[PDB]
Amino acid sequence: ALPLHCSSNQALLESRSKTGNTQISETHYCNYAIGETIPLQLIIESS
């Protein structure tokens, strides 16, 4: 299956929503945020 853009909390999710970087996966101390593998939101925004 595929990984999708999830995060540990709204803290990491807000910076993801700011920078738009849903591909690169990034980790805080014990909080993690997983990068999405297909930018389907950008796909729908392009059509």
């Binding site: 595929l2 999708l4 995060s7 540990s8 909390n9 980790t27 805080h28 014990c30 909080n31 993690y32």
Partner: protein, 48 residues
């Protein structure tokens, strides 16, 4: 006009070990020091 079925997986409650823990993007976010922020218990993600 045919349909796909893409299957997604995602974790919750994964305890990253503090013993080798770290953080990038320290400049972007800063948590408020509470153990509910210091352990993942929930997962937030966007809908459709």
């Amino acid at each position: 006009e045919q349909s796909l079925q893409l299957t997604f997986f995602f974790p919750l409650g994964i305890y990253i070990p503090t013993e080798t823990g770290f953080s990038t993007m320290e400049t972007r976010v800063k948590l408020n020091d509470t153990m509910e922020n210091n352990l993942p218990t929930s997962v937030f993600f966007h809908n459709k």
